[PDB]
Symmetry: D2
Subunit: 295 residues, 4 copies
Amino acid sequence: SKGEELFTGVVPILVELDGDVNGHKFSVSGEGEGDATYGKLTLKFICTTGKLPVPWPTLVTTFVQCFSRYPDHMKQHDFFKSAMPEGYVQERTIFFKDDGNYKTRAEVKFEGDTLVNRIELKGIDFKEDGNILGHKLEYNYNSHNVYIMADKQKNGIKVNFKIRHNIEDGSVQLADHYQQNTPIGDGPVLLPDNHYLSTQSNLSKDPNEKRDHMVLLEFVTAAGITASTKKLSESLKRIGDELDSNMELQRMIAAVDTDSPREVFFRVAADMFSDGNFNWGRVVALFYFASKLVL
Amino acid sequence: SKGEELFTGVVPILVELDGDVNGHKFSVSGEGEGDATYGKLTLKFICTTGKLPVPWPTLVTTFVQCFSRYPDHMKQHDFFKSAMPEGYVQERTIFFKDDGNYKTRAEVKFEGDTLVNRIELKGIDFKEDGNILGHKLEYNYNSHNVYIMADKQKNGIKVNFKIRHNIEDGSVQLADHYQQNTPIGDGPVLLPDNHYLSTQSNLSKDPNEKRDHMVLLEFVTAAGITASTKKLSESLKRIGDELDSNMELQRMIAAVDTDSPREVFFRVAADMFSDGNFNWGRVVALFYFASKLVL
Amino acid sequence: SKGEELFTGVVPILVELDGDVNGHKFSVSGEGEGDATYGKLTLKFICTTGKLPVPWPTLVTTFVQCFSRYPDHMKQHDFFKSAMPEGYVQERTIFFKDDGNYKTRAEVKFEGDTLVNRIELKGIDFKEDGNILGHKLEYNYNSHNVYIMADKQKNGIKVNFKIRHNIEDGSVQLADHYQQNTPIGDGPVLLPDNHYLSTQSNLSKDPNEKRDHMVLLEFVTAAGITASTKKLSESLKRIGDELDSNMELQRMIAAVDTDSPREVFFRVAADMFSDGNFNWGRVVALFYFASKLVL
Amino acid sequence: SKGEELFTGVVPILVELDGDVNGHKFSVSGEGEGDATYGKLTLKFICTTGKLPVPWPTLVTTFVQCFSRYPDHMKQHDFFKSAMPEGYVQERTIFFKDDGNYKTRAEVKFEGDTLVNRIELKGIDFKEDGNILGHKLEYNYNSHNVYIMADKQKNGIKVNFKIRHNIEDGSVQLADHYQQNTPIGDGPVLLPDNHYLSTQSNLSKDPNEKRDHMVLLEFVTAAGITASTKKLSESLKRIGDELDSNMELQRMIAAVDTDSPREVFFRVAADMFSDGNFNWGRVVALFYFASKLVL
């Protein structure tokens, strides 16, 4: 990629956000630098509209995956960099469980020597007493894996992952992310095989800063890419897939009386084997059953 | 059934067989009595043509399942008795693994007070040094479950099971039995739900008999019958069924290099999860894989 | 053994019993014959004192394990025959679960050509509405493995096994059998390695008998014998043994609140691994725990 | 703790090392700052003796666990801070697998407003062609958990963990760390319950620095602390412990012929059950066996 030659050495980063969550508007400006070579990000965010409506941790993901470190044997699956300097568009939808959602659209591109992230975000359906709008999130972060996948039809990628937020009672607010990327530029881009980005982050405060702010450090590394063994697991995939997605079956098992579970399994077991034609397929399909007799 | 009333008390039994195994002909006459009340059978067999060309054990199953004890709660799934006194026809095929086969047709019915089994048997493809024609079966028997299933279209029953014959070196000769029963009469019969007959047997000699003979003692008891739980396992059945019968998949897995198996599993495991979308279906489909990495 | 030569061919059998069950006395005489060559037993029992106070099935085991077929490779671990013609003494205790017990002593030996079993039986602690004294046993039998073990110190054998009696409601009455055999004679006997007798049995009536009777048919075959591999499993034995018998632990686990079980396991799991020193021993000891979180 | 009040707000850090590895001497000086409040470390190392004998990654651990972030419910198990300002002594031994070892002794204490780490390190027995002295380690790092444990007898703590180093061929150099801490000061210190430190690190280069150097960013958080459920798992611990440490047994199983493994298991299985006294203990002890029939 021609983009790859932009990401050697420390690059300056600048970030602009306009947010709107349950009619709370707000703006964030961020600056810093990223070192792709060692998969390193450092960024400072100032709330430019006063205090922040939402907790800081909720925005970490919204606020540069072109600064991930790609190992040499992988560097031909780096879509992010390959899209530069013209850049890409990053659209996400973020479902917090039992609560509202964000919908974002960013343009990431180069404006001279600087890499800028320009974001519009729009939250709705939050619960005034919830984890978000109640500010019950802990000022911290965890590590996640960012499964990428090509979208050869739309010349971009499809991304998905699930962020865990800590809360003070020990519980964990889930944040189901559905992401999609697409080149603003007309030039060709790398369209990757399935792999992931292993992310780690910590959140801190500057002690000579009195406005509402977050100091964000990100670590990012690409991974998950090491025959005909390929062709085999593609099938094992679909067989377990059609299985877990077979709406007939899922409905059928949910619909069962399992307060007195022990009898229910045994009779269904013995009913399966009334024709007495045992094969490993049934041993397993009944072990998916005895499996499902847990949750 | 009206047939049931004929099988209270001890019934005299008469058995006639005409055989041909690799162009070896032979005949067998058997007499004894049967007690369906306590599922009991005693029979003596004389070879009327000199010595027997096959081992006695191979002939036990060929040589009255209307003498099975049906527990009270089952007596309506008793097909065999219900077809009497007019009778039924019992056709089998018997694949000795790695070896020849028997193809039988027998008419079982009443002739006055006696219950007669009249048999023609035809064996082809045995090995002149095999387990049968070489006579390497031990003079004994083991216990087996005889799975029955209605055949509503043919007004009879399908039957299948698998006899294990002991051999001297400790190994075991399989005898895959494929059976079917059909009423000679036009009267109505009973068409059973899936159940099974639990058979136990012992083979002996009479010490005042000098002709080639077998003394056969059989015990036979029906079993395997105790909702919407029915409808559920019908599906679990087919899902494990299509699975084990999916010729694509079976071919695919057989076609794999498993002398160095440990790597093969792990990479296929990690290839399945390169898109990192885990669901129990795949956990199980890969546990059918790691399963199959045994035989 | 010289005893073995007495058990070729059909031997006449005679059986005498004197009983006392909850102050109910009774007597039983049985005659038949035994064929050790094909492990075969046929016996008829008359109640000489009118009706029987107990169900017939309870008495089957009390009512000739010297008629078991020992395969050629085993015939040196045949204790029963080797003690003949002088004989042996067979003492049992029989705990019906949730119920009374039989304490028997029998002398089995030859008196000329006949093999006699002479029995005194004494039952206490039954329930006047129980499974026995209430007569709720079904007139049938199941198949059992009779584990034998040498008792080199007492020049005899220890024996133990567990009979399952069928009852009408579908439940099953256990009969925990604790046996021991000891030669009346001074001659040398055979002291067996661990093996077992595979028994199968059927109970019936004679239709020209008007007195209270049982017709008993037994099949009995020795089995369970095929290095330094011996020495290994002796240890695996004790390790699982001390484990299951460790009264500290058994008490400890029984003493746990498992109405809300899911949390209990996880915390104990995480408490085991707070020092974070994982080894397979703990993976297994916790898999004995998660195991025990079932019954 | 009185030490806790020293670690609010950004503290300056200064590090001195004198190393000697296979007669290669060297010196490292490091400076930077740590923010305990958010479990954050930033440090720069300059090689003051020229080029470095050993790879940079090998020293990360040697080069401030008093800057870990302790959650409020844990802050009474913070030994590190409690030992301040007088400080503690940190002794480690580091076994790299299939290669040499480091032995270190540091004094960590306050010298005015600064937290200084003073280190003597001494490596021996490395292989001139190895992963270390050959420089085959990758300039990166992974995440680890740092299991702490009190040593109430020696008024300090015992620490242990296992660092994985990446190598270019995809393989992983292990670094078994055995650590121990002890107050230079005579004042009392907190002696913790079992918990761990979750560490994450990345390694980078300053682009305006021409001497041999590492930029080290560490993230550190305490965790692993959430009844009578305590007392239970203490036992499950020892039972799986004595088990995995029982040298009799471990020797015994290693000593077995497992090129033809299938027979070996089955016979040992059948030998365990020749007395036919099944209990869950043996089911598990044999499932530790069938377990061990893998590696």
